Scaffold this active site. Structure first.
Site, PDB file in Angstrom:
ATOM      1  CD  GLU B  65      -2.763   1.458   2.094  1.00 35.51           C
ATOM      2  OE1 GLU B  65      -2.194   1.688   3.435  1.00 35.51           O
ATOM      3  OE2 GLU B  65      -4.213   1.878   1.885  1.00 35.51           O
ATOM      4  CD1 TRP B  87      -6.080   0.686  -0.057  1.00 34.32           C
ATOM      5  CD2 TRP B  87      -7.538   2.426  -0.647  1.00 34.32           C
ATOM      6  NE1 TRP B  87      -5.757   2.052   0.138  1.00 34.32           N
ATOM      7  CE2 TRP B  87      -6.914   2.710   0.073  1.00 34.32           C
ATOM      8  CE3 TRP B  87      -9.672   2.507  -0.849  1.00 34.32           C
ATOM      9  CZ2 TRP B  87      -7.050   4.173   0.570  1.00 34.32           C
ATOM     10  CZ3 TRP B  87      -9.678   3.806  -0.531  1.00 34.32           C
ATOM     11  CH2 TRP B  87      -8.390   4.696   0.437  1.00 34.32           C
ATOM     12  CE1 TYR B 113      -4.766   9.345   3.125  1.00 33.02           C
ATOM     13  CE2 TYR B 113      -6.289   6.846   1.771  1.00 33.02           C
ATOM     14  CZ  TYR B 113      -6.217   8.159   3.483  1.00 33.02           C
ATOM     15  OH  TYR B 113      -6.751   8.187   4.298  1.00 33.02           O
ATOM     16  CB  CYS B 173      -8.162   8.572   7.380  1.00 35.19           C
ATOM     17  SG  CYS B 173      -9.360   8.005   8.364  1.00 35.19           S
ATOM     18  NE  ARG B 193     -10.125  12.707   7.068  1.00 35.56           N
ATOM     19  CZ  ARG B 193     -11.655  11.920   7.466  1.00 35.56           C
ATOM     20  NH1 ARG B 193     -12.126  12.259   8.414  1.00 35.56           N
ATOM     21  NH2 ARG B 193     -11.565  10.516   6.852  1.00 35.56           N
ATOM     22  CG  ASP B 196     -11.280   1.377  13.825  1.00 35.89           C
ATOM     23  OD1 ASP B 196     -11.103   0.785  15.197  1.00 35.89           O
ATOM     24  OD2 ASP B 196     -12.050   0.477  13.404  1.00 35.89           O
TER      25      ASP B 196
HETATM   26  O1  LIG Z   1      -5.694   4.983   7.115  1.00 36.00           O
HETATM   27  C1  LIG Z   1      -6.709   5.236   8.181  1.00 36.00           C
HETATM   28  C2  LIG Z   1      -7.739   4.637   7.102  1.00 36.00           C
HETATM   29  C3  LIG Z   1      -9.673   4.853   8.118  1.00 36.00           C
HETATM   30  N1  LIG Z   1      -9.170   4.851   9.303  1.00 36.00           N
HETATM   31  C4  LIG Z   1     -10.993   4.960  10.314  1.00 36.00           C
HETATM   32  C5  LIG Z   1     -10.663   5.920  10.638  1.00 36.00           C
HETATM   33  C6  LIG Z   1     -12.408   6.111  11.093  1.00 36.00           C
HETATM   34  O2  LIG Z   1     -12.757   4.254  11.416  1.00 36.00           O
HETATM   35  C7  LIG Z   1     -12.338   5.515   9.411  1.00 36.00           C
HETATM   36  C8  LIG Z   1     -13.161   6.843   8.707  1.00 36.00           C
HETATM   37  O3  LIG Z   1     -14.385   7.157   8.805  1.00 36.00           O
HETATM   38  P1  LIG Z   1     -14.243   8.879   8.628  1.00 36.00           P
HETATM   39  O4  LIG Z   1     -13.676   9.531   9.611  1.00 36.00           O
HETATM   40  O5  LIG Z   1     -13.748   9.290   7.517  1.00 36.00           O
HETATM   41  O6  LIG Z   1     -15.816   8.460   8.798  1.00 36.00           O
HETATM   42  O7  LIG Z   1     -11.334   4.781   8.973  1.00 36.00           O
HETATM   43  C9  LIG Z   1      -8.130   4.497   9.983  1.00 36.00           C
HETATM   44  O8  LIG Z   1      -7.981   4.775  10.663  1.00 36.00           O
HETATM   45  N2  LIG Z   1      -6.633   4.521   9.290  1.00 36.00           N
END
Ligand SMILES: O=c1ccn([C@H]2C[C@H](O)[C@@H](COP(=O)(O)O)O2)c(=O)[nH]1
Ligand SMILES: O=c1ccn([C@H]2C[C@H](O)[C@@H](COP(=O)(O)O)O2)c(=O)[nH]1
Lengths: 279, 283
Positions: B65, B87, B113, B173, B193, B196
Site C-alpha cells: 500500500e 482497497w 493519497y 484520513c 484526522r 480507528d
Molecule cells: O488510514 C486510515 C483510514 C481510515 N481509518 C478509519 C478511521 C474511521 O473509523 C474510518 C474513516 O471514517 P471517517 O473518519 O471518514 O468518518 O476509517 C483509519 O483508522 N486509518
C-alpha cells in the site's frame, strides 16, 4: 495545569532543545511534536498572565482572517502594525512579488479559510462566492452533523504558497464535538514559543469560543500541536525571567452577542474579564 | 507522547478510550467510544520499526500500500494484482455509485493519497492516465530539501486537497505529514484526522514509520522518531471485547527494519529491498 503547560514547554526547550539554525541563520533551541491542551470550560480563555498579551492585536488579526482579508493596510488603519513588515515593498520584492501592491500579502490564512482554491487577483478584489468556504462549511456541519470526523480548515495550499508573503504557520485546524462541547485542534508546523505561540494560543482559543456561540455549543478544549517548537537564542534570558513569574488564573471571555454571519463579529461584541497579566 | 514507552503507548491509548471515551455516533451510526487529540511517539533508532506485537500486522499489505502511495497510484486493481485486497471494497461499482461517481471505472479510487503526494493540484482523469510532470511533487521536493536545507520548517506533504475531495472514493484520513531534522536524524509527524484505534491506526503507525526509514536511507540521514497525532481517536463498539483481550497480551520487543539498498528514485523501492527482522507477534 493551564499556563504551566506553556511554561513547562519553555523549560523543556531550554533544557532539552537541540541547537538548530533558522532561514537567516539565527540560532534556536528546538524540539519536534510537542502538544498543549487548554480548557475553554467556564468561559476560560488561555491568554497568558506571565506576560501581557496584545489582546487587541489578537482580536483584530483574527477578525481580519475570518473576513478573508489579506490587506495589511486594513490592519494598519486599526493601529495593528504586526503585518506591515511582510507587506513592505522591500519584503514583497525579496519574495519576487514585484507587481504586488504594498500591504498586499497574497492569498494568506483567511483567504484560504473562506476562499480555498479561488484565483487571487489583489487584496481589494471581490471574492464573494469564490473558492471553498471552509469556515462556513464547518459551521453548517457543527449545526447539522456535529459527529463529523472531517471538520478541517486548512491554509496549507501548495499551489498558492509562491503567491503568499510567507507560507502558513498555523496551517490546519480540526473541530470536534462531544457532550455539546466544541473542541479545536491546531496543527502548527513552526512555533516561536517566546513570541508567536502565546498569540496563536489566544487566537484559536478565541476562534473556538466565537464558533461555539455561532452554533449553540459550549467551548470545550483547545489543543495546539506543534511541528518545530523553538526558542530563539536572543529570547533565552527574557524567557528565564518570565519563568519566575507566578501565573494568575486565566481570564474569562464574555460574549455579548453573536451575529448571523461569523465575519460580522466586531471587537465590541466580546471582551476579556479579569485579565491580570504581570507588568 | 514519550518515545521509549513503545507499544505500551498504544495499549494505554486503547485503555484510555475504553475508560474515558465519550459515546459518539459515526457516519452510519454504528457507535464509537471517542477522545480528541491524543499523540503517540515511536523511536526509529537502532533500526526499530513500531510494528505491533500484541496483534499480527499485515506487513506485506503495509508495504505494498505504501509503495503504491509513493508511486502516486490510485488503481485498487494494481493492489489486487499483488494479492492485497484492502482497497477493493472502496473501488467497487456499488461504492463508487454511492459517492456519485457513476462514470468512474471499477477500482479507480480518484485522486487519493499518493496522487496528492506526487501530483498535488494536477487535473485528474483516470488511474491509468500519465501524470509524469503533472502537479506538485511534494515528496520529491521534501527529499531535495532534506539533502539541501534539512533545518527547513516547511517540509509538509498533504493529501488534504479541498478541491479534489468530491473526486475521491473517501476523504484522506492520514492527511498531513511534516518532516524534521536534528543531529542527522529524520523525524516525521503525521496529523491524522480520524483513527480507528482497533483496526486502521496500527497499520498507519507501521506505514509512516516505514516511509521515514525509507526516506532517511534516500538522503543519508538516520531515522529519529515517528509521531502520530490523532484528531478523533476512537474504538468501534463492535471491537470493545476483542481489544480488552488484546490488552492482556504482554508486548514483545519491536522488530528491526533492514534496508539492503536504496534506489535512485523513492518510487523504485520494492518489497525485496528491505525486510522485518525478529518480528514476533502474538498469534
Ligand atoms: O488510514 C486510515 C483510514 C481510515 N481509518 C478509519 C478511521 C474511521 O473509523 C474510518 C474513516 O471514517 P471517517 O473518519 O471518514 O468518518 O476509517 C483509519 O483508522 N486509518
Ligand atoms: O503564527 C505564527 C507565525 C510565525 N511564527 C514563527 C515561527 C518561526 O519562528 C517563524 C516563521 O519561520 P518559518 O517557520 O516559516 O521558517 O515565525 C509563529 O510562531 N507563529
Amino acid at each position: 495545569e493551564g499556563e504551566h503547560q506553556y511554561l513547562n514547554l519553555v523549560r523543556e526547550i531550554l533544557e532539552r532543545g537541540v541547537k538548530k539554525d533558522d532561514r537567516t541563520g539565527t540560532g534556536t533551541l528546538s524540539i519536534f511534536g510537542p502538544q498543549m491542551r487548554f480548557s475553554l470550560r467556564d468561559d476560560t480563555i488561555p491568554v497568558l498572565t506571565t506576560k501581557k498579551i496584545f489582546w487587541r492585536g489578537v482580536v483584530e488579526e483574527l477578525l481580519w482572517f475570518i473576513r478573508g482579508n489579506t490587506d495589511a493596510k486594513e490592519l494598519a488603519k486599526k493601529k495593528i502594525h504586526i503585518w506591515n513588515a511582510n507587506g513592505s515593498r522591500e519584503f514583497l520584492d525579496s519574495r519576487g512579488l514585484y507587481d504586488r501592491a504594498e500591504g498586499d500579502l497574497g492569498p494568506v490564512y483567511g483567504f484560504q479559510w473562506r476562499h480555498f482554491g479561488a484565483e487571487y487577483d489583489t487584496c481589494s478584489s471581490d471574492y464573494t462566492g469564490k473558492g471553498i468556504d471552509q469556515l462556513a462549511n464547518i459551521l453548517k456541519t457543527l449545526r447539522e452533523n456535529p459527529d463529523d470526523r472531517r471538520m478541517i480548515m486548512t491554509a496549507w495550499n501548495p499551489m498558492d504558497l509562491h503567491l503568499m508573503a510567507l507560507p502558513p504557520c498555523h496551517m490546519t485546524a480540526q473541530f470536534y464535538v462531544a457532550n455539546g462541547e466544541l473542541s479545536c485542534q491546531l496543527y502548527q508546523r513552526s512555533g516561536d514559543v517566546g513570541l508567536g505561540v502565546p498569540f496563536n494560543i489566544a487566537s484559536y482559543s478565541l476562534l473556538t469560543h466565537l464558533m461555539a456561540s455561532m452554533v449553540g455549543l459550549k467551548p470545550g478544549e483547545f489543543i495546539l500541536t506543534l511541528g518545530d517548537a523553538h526558542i530563539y537564542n536572543t529570547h533565552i534570558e527574557v524567557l528565564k525571567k518570565q519563568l519566575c513569574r507566578v501565573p494568575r488564573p486565566f481570564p474569562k471571555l464574555r460574549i455579548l452577542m453573536a451575529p448571523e454571519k461569523i465575519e460580522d463579529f466586531t471587537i465590541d461584541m466580546f471582551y476579556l474579564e479579569g485579565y491580570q497579566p504581570h507588568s
